[PDB]
Amino acid sequence: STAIVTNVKHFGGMGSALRLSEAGHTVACHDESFKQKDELEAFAETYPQLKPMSEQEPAELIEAVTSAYGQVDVLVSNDIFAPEFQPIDKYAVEDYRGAVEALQIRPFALVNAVASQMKKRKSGHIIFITSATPFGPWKELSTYTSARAGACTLANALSKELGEYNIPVFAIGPNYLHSEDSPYFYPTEPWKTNPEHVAHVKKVTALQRLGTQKELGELVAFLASGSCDYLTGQVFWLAGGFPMIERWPGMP
Amino acid sequence: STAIVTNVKHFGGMGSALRLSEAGHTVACHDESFKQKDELEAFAETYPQLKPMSEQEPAELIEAVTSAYGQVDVLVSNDIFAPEFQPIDKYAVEDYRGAVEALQIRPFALVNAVASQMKKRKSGHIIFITSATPFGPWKELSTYTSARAGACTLANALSKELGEYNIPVFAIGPNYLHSEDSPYFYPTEPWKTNPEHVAHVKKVTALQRLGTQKELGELVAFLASGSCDYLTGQVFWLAGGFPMIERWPGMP
Amino acid sequence: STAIVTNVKHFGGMGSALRLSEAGHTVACHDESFKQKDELEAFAETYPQLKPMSEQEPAELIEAVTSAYGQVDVLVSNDIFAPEFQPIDKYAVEDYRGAVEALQIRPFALVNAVASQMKKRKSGHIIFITSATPFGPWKELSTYTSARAGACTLANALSKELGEYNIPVFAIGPNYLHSEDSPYFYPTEPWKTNPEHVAHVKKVTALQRLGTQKELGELVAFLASGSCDYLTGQVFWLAGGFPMIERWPGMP
Amino acid sequence: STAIVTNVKHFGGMGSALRLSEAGHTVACHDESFKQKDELEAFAETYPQLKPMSEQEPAELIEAVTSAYGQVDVLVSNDIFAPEFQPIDKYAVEDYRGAVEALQIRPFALVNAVASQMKKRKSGHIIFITSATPFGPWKELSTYTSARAGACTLANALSKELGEYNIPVFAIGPNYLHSEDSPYFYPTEPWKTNPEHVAHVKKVTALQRLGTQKELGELVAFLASGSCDYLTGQVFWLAGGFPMIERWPGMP
Ligand SMILES: O=[N+]([O-])c1ccc([C@@H]2CO2)cc1
Ligand SMILES: O=[N+]([O-])c1ccc([C@@H]2CO2)cc1
Ligand SMILES: O=[N+]([O-])c1ccc([C@@H]2CO2)cc1
Ligand SMILES: O=[N+]([O-])c1ccc([C@@H]2CO2)cc1
Full 3-state SS string of chain C: CEEEECCCCCCCHHHHHHHHHHCCCEEEECCHHHHCHHHHHHHHHHCCCCEECCCCCHHHHHHHHHHHHCCCCEEEEECCCCCCCCCCCCCCHHHHHHHHHHHHHHHHHHHHHHHHHHHHHCCCEEEEECCCCCCCCCCCCHHHHHHHHHHHHHHHHHHHHHHHHCCCEEEEEECCEEEECCCCCEEHHHHCCCHHHHHHHHHHCCCCCCECHHHHHHHHHHHHCCCCHHHCCCEEEECCCCCCCCCCCCCC
Distances (CA, A) of C168 to A21, A42, C52, C127, C234: 27, 39, 25, 8, 9
Which residue of chain C is at minimal alpha-carbon distance from B134?
C245
Report the alpha-carbon distance of residue B33 to residue B22 in Å, rounded. 24
Query: Which protein residue has the closest C-alpha to ligand 2 atom 5?
Result: B185
Report the alpha-carbon distance of residue B185 to residue B200 in Å, rounded. 15
Which residue of chain A is at minimal alpha-carbon distance from D195?
A249
Mutate to test the pocket of ligand 3, among C78, C131, C201 (most ligand atoms within 8 A of CB): C131
Mutate to test the pocket of ligand 3, among C144, C148, C191 (most ligand atoms within 8 A of CB): C144
**Shortest CA gap A87–chain C (Å):** 30
- The beta-carbon neighbor of B160 closest among D206, D229, D237 is D206
Contact D19, D78 (CB under 8 A): no
Provide the 10 A C-beta neighbour count for residue A228. 24
Boundaries of every domain in chain A: 1-252
A187: left (phi over 0), alpha (psi -120 to 50) or beta: beta
Distances (CA, A) of D115 to B252, D53, D59: 20, 20, 11
- For ligand 4, is residue D133 a contact (CB within 6 Å)? yes
Which residue of chain A is at minimal alpha-carbon distance from D203?
A246
Phi/psi for D141 (5° steps) reads: -145, 40
- For ligand 2, is residue B242 a contact (CB within 6 Å)? no
Provide the 10 A C-beta neighbour count for residue A247. 15
Taking the CA atoms of residue C194, residue C200, residue C203 and residue C206 in that order, the dihedral angle to the nearest 10 degrees is -80
Pocket residues: Cβ below 6 A from ligand 3: C 83, 131, 133, 144, 174-175, 185
At A226, is the secondary structure helix, strand, or coil?
A: coil
Report the alpha-carbon distance of residue D226 to residue A145 in Å, rounded. 36
Provide the 10 A C-beta neighbour count for residue D248. 14
Chain A residues at the D interface, defined by Cβ less than 8 Å, are 85, 136-139, 194, 196-197, 200, 203-204, 206, 243-251
Is residue A252 exposed (0-12), middle (13-18) or buried (19+ Cβ within 10 Å)? Answer: exposed
- For ligand 4, is residue D131 a contact (CB within 6 Å)? yes
Ligand 4 centroid to Cα of residue D175, in Å, is: 7
Report the alpha-carbon distance of residue D74 to residue D1 in Å, rounded. 8
Residue B58: asked if its preceding bond is cis (omega within 30°), the reply is no
B121: left (phi over 0), alpha (psi -120 to 50) or beta: alpha
Ligand nearest to the CA of B152: 2
Q: At a CB cut-off of 8 Å and minimum separation 6, what does C60 contact?
A: none
DSSP letter string, D69-131: HS---EEEEE---------GGGS-HHHHHHHHIIIIIHHHHHHHHHHHHHHHHT--EEEEE--
**Shortest CA gap D169–chain C (Å):** 12
Interchain CB distance below 8 Å, C249 and B203 = no
Contact A156, A126 (CB under 8 A): no
Is residue C92 exposed (0-12), middle (13-18) or buried (19+ Cβ within 10 Å)? Answer: exposed
Chains in contact with chain D (at least 3 beta-carbon pairs closer than 8 A): A, B, C
Provide the 10 A C-beta neighbour count for residue B223. 25
Which residues of A fall within a CB distance of 8 Å from B115? 87-89
Spacing of C-alpha C174 from chain mean position: 8
The string over A60-77, giving b where at least 16 C-beta atoms fall within 10 Å of a residue's C-beta and e elsewhere, is: ebbebbbeebebbbbbbb
Chain C residues at the D interface, defined by Cβ less than 8 Å, are 58, 87-89, 91, 93, 96-97, 100, 104-105, 108-109, 111-112, 115-116, 119, 134, 137-143, 145-154, 156-158, 160-162, 164
Q: After which residues is chain A broken (C to N over 2.5 A)?
A: none
Interchain CB distance below 8 Å, D153 and C137 = yes
D97: left (phi over 0), alpha (psi -120 to 50) or beta: alpha
Provide the 10 A C-beta neighbour count for residue A251. 10
Provide the 10 A C-beta neighbour count for residue A15. 28
Phi/psi for A102 (5° steps) reads: -75, -30
Taking the CA atoms of residue D29, residue D32, residue D37 and residue D40 in that order, the dihedral angle to the nearest 10 degrees is -30
Interchain CB distance below 8 Å, B238 and D230 = yes
Among residues B162, B146, B78, which one has the least CA distance to residue B114?
B162
3-state secondary structure D18-85: HHHHHCCCEEEECCHHHHCHHHHHHHHHHCCCEEECCCCCHHHHHHHHHHHHCCCCEEEEECCCCCCC
Report the alpha-carbon distance of residue A190 to residue A87 in Å, rounded. 25
Phi/psi for A67 (5° steps) reads: -65, -45
Radius of gyration of chain B from Cα atoms? 18
D1-252: CATH homologous superfamily? NAD(P)-binding Rossmann-like Domain (3.40.50.720)
Counting runs of H as helices and runs of E as strands, what totals does chain B give? 9, 7
- For ligand 1, is residue A104 a contact (CB within 6 Å)? no
Q: Residue type for C114, please?
A: V
Q: State in Å, rounded, how far the first CA of chain B is from the last one.
A: 50
Experimental approach taken: X-ray
Contact A16, A216 (CB under 8 A): yes
- Angle between the N-to-C axes of helices D142-162 and C142-162, in degrees from 0 to 180, rounded to the nearest 10: 150
Provide the 10 A C-beta neighbour count for residue D189. 11
Mutate to test the pocket of ligand 2, among B7, B130, B131, B235 (most ligand atoms within 8 A of CB): B131
Ligand 1 centroid to Cα of residue B56, in Å, is: 34
Which residue of chain B is at minimal alpha-carbon distance from C243?
B245
Report the alpha-carbon distance of residue C173 to residue C129 in Å, rounded. 6
Report the alpha-carbon distance of residue C219 to residue C212 in Å, rounded. 11
Query: Which protein residue has the closest C-alpha to ligand 2 atom 11?
Result: B185
Provide the 10 A C-beta neighbour count for residue D200. 18
- Angle between the N-to-C axes of helices A93-100 and A142-162, in degrees from 0 to 180, rounded to the nearest 10: 30
Among residues D137, C102, B218, which one has the least CA distance to residue A245?
D137
Q: At a CB cut-off of 8 Å and minimum separation 6, what does A192 contact?
A: A178, A198, A210
Is residue A27 exposed (0-12), middle (13-18) or buried (19+ Cβ within 10 Å)? Answer: buried
Q: After which residues is chain C broken (C to N over 2.5 A)?
A: none
Ligand 3 centroid to Cα of residue C52, in Å, is: 26
Residue D243: asked if its preceding bond is cis (omega within 30°), the reply is yes
Among residues B173, B170, B143, B163, which one has the least CA distance to residue B225?
B170
At A58, is the secondary structure helix, strand, or coil?
A: helix
